[PDB]
Amino acid sequence: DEVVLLDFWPSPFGMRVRIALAEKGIKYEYKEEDLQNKSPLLLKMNPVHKKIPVLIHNGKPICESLIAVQYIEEVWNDRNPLLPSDPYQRAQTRFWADYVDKKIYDLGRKICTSKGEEKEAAKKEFIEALKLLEEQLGDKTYFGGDNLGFVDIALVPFYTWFKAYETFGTLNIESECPKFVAWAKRCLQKESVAKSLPDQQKVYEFIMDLRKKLGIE
Amino acid sequence: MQDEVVLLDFWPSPFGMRVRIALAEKGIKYEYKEEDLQNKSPLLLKMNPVHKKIPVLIHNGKPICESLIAVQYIEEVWNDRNPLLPSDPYQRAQTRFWADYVDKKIYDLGRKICTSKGEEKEAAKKEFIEALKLLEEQLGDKTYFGGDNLGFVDIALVPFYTWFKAYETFGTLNIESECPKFVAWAKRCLQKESVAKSLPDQQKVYEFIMDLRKKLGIE
Ligand SMILES: N[C@@H](CCC(=O)N[C@@H](CSCc1ccc([N+](=O)[O-])cc1)C(=O)NCC(=O)O)C(=O)O
Numbered sequence A: 001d002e003v004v005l006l007d008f009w010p011s012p013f014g015m016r017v018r019i020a021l022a023e024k025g026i027k028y029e030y031k032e033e034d035l036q037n038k039s040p041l042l043l044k045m046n047p048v049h050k051k052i053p054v055l056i057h058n059g060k061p062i063c064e065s066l067i068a069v070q071y072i073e074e075v076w077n078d079r080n081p082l083l084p085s086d087p088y089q090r091a092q093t094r095f096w097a098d099y100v101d102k103k104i105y106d107l108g109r110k111i112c113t114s115k116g117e118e119k120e121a122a123k124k125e126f127i128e129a130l131k132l133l134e135e136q137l138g139d140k141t142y143f144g145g146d147n148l149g150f151v152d153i154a155l156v157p158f159y160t161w162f163k164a165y166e167t168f169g170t171l172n173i174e175s176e177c178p179k180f181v182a183w184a185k186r187c188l189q190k191e192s193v194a195k196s197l198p199d200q201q202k203v204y205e206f207i208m209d210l211r212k213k214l215g216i217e
Numbered sequence B: 001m002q003d004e005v006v007l008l009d010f011w012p013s014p015f016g017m018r019v020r021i022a023l024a025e026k027g028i029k030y031e032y033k034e035e036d037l038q039n040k041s042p043l044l045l046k047m048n049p050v051h052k053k054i055p056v057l058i059h060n061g062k063p064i065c066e067s068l069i070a071v072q073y074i075e076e077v078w079n080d081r082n083p084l085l086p087s088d089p090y091q092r093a094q095t096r097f098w099a100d101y102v103d104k105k106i107y108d109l110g111r112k113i114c115t116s117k118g119e120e121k122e123a124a125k126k127e128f129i130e131a132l133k134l135l136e137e138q139l140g141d142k143t144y145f146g147g148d149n150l151g152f153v154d155i156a157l158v159p160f161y162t163w164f165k166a167y168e169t170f171g172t173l174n175i176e177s178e179c180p181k182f183v184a185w186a187k188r189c190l191q192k193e194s195v196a197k198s199l200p201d202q203q204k205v206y207e208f209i210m211d212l213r214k215k216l217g218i219e
């Protein structure tokens, strides 16, 4: 049984798959991709999108981070269930992971790259989204309840981008959304998460360089 | 049936049509409620506070929003007939991949064909045909994307066929010329009662969009 993950270290999408694999206790080979110089392997495995992450299981690719996490859930179904068994609860978990997928990366990218009114609107919507997510969390330890679940996996990687969001967006997420930050730190107490996520400083530095190389600031 | 099943929808919505087909394929009698998107009902706003969009499937008073998530819910709840997804995890991942591709591409490219002008429109026409061709390649020689039976990708995609006269007329396209296998597939789908009963006529969607374009000052 071979498991390989094509990834790029600061990608929140790849981090999702890293976490799912670690949480299931699945040993795998991580392969770092240069997105400026995509490998023949990456191009062969994801011809449609040419993006990471790509999960390769016994030579067969699974593209799209959340689809890969669901695949992991369905194949390694012995322990640590990432989705609820009840259909309605499963639909809700999918709904919120979908919400994260649609909002967070894009709003964050606009925070880090856009300017003026687009930037302002992105900041506002970003905080609104975090607050909606806080509301959904309620007084649960994780979105998954007492254990990490699909939504936690979908969402917590974006925490690694928080210094970038706060610095370039002039936000103080800590004071606006303390429930959210406390939740993220709880996730970071889990080995599966800790070992999958780079530090906020490394990501901040990477994004700073990215901006400087895009002629932003 | 003891269950209450209600669908909040807007008749020409490809997204709502997915849920209609899924319910019909399971043989579920449901209450359809037409929504005016310019005058959304209190029920719609209550059931989908996050997106305020249709379709919303309401099962025993609980809402399931997002069309593909609703189709999956229907599959998991009514799991003793006409399975809409494969059992093999890898095949399931591939079906999800292609449904996702449809979700990311088709509606927005079609919208641009129907409402854009100039270079944006020409670009959207090109990308649209390219996407249909990629999907055609995935279909291969199978009867449906799901194989011998209608599947998740068929449900995700066939509603867009109802917009084809609109795409062809507003975009100056001949999709059957470009993609004959695709069109033959869609027509096969439309021969199934579950699909036929769920989908409006192309002419009606065309008339609707023609009018909308006029209202928006598009031409
Ligand atoms: N929907 C996909 C999204 C994955 C994705 O966006 N992957 C990015 C890397 S993470 C996001 C990202 C992209 C680029 C930079 N960058 O510094 O240039 C940083 C982060 C990618 O491979 N892009 C390749 C390409 O388009 O060429 C999923 O969930 O898996």
Ligand SMILES: N[C@@H](CCC(=O)N[C@@H](CSCc1ccc([N+](=O)[O-])cc1)C(=O)NCC(=O)O)C(=O)O
Residues within 6 Å of the ligand: B010, B012, B013, B014, B015, B016, B037, B052, B053, B054, B055, B065, B066, B067, B068, B209, B212
């Ligand atoms: N991702 C969602 C997308 C659903 C969606 O886009 N719903 C639209 C109607 S279908 C797309 C559509 C919109 C408008 C027209 N039209 O002719 O005016 C046609 C089709 C909606 O409720 N819009 C309300 C709003 O945004 O406020 C899903 O898959 O369910």
Ligand SMILES: O=[N+](O)c1ccc(CS)cc1
Residues within 6 Å of the ligand: A108, A109, A110, A112, A113, A207, A210, A211
């Ligand atoms: O800082 N960013 O979030 C970011 C900047 C530029 C890209 C390349 S499209 C992607 C992400």
Ligand SMILES: O=[N+](O)c1ccc(CS)cc1
Residues within 6 Å of the ligand: B110, B111, B112, B114, B115, B209, B212
């Ligand atoms: O023709 N269209 O695809 C279309 C036109 C207008 C809207 C709502 S702004 C949505 C879709």
Ligand SMILES: O=[N+](O)c1ccc(CS)cc1
Residues within 6 Å of the ligand: B011, B012, B020, B032, B197, B198, B199, B200, B201
């Ligand atoms: O063709 N249609 O637009 C359509 C089909 C079926 C229903 C459910 S009564 C509603 C609308």
